């Protein structure tokens, strides 16, 4: 489980923008998966699950590697959000398009709490956006996660600011 090059990525392209998604870890992949997403485009990569390595010769080849879950130096999912909307309106703006790659710790689902922030501030309900990402077989049920909406307005974001 380290130089498997057969499986790929999947590129999601949104009205907003595309994003690429990879299952498996990192580390011992990665000398891979960077490979991978400079070819699909992905000169962006974002990590929001847990943070395992150090962005270095990946980043100075030209790659913006944004690093959230690393330490308590970082906010709580919560507040992420607003975060999460100015970048991937940004990663589309830098660019007449462009790609995101996007990676999690494997184990239950993967990570669909990022692409689903877009699906509800595009207009949609997060109680029918479950029933949306969640298609892939759990991963997207947690507490914070979901009841997320009930502080954080659908509002103001992917409508009229920019």
């Given amino acids: 489980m380290a130089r498997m090059n ?6 999601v392209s949104y009205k907003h923008m595309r994003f690429l998604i990879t299952h498996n870890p990192t580390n ?6 960077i490979e991978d ?3 699909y485009g992905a000169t962006t990569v974002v990590r929001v699950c ?7 010769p990946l980043e100075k080849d030209g790659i913006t590697v ?7 130096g970082a906010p709580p999912p919560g507040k992420v959000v607003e975060d999460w909307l100015s970048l991937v309106k940004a990663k589309f703006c830098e ?19 990022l692409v689903a922030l877009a699906l ?6 997060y109680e029918d956006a479950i029933q949306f990402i969640r298609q892939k077989r759990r991963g997207a049920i947690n507490s914070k996660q979901l009841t997320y909406l ?3 307005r659908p509002k103001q974001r992917l409508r009229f600011k920019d």
């Fill in 66 to 72: 944004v690093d959230w879950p690393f330490d308590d």
């Fill in 150 to 152: 009930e502080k954080y």
């Fill in 95 to 113: 660019a007449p398009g462009s790609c995101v790659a996007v990676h999690c710790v494997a184990g239950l689902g993967r990570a669909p709490v």
């Fill in 120 to 125: 509800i501030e595009s207009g949609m309900k």
């Fill in 28 to 33: 011992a992949t990665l000398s891979t998966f």
């Fill in 37 to 39: 997403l400079k070819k």
């Fill in 50 to 56: 847990e943070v395992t390595y150090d962005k270095t």
């Fill in 6 to 11: 057969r499986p790929a990525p999947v590129e």
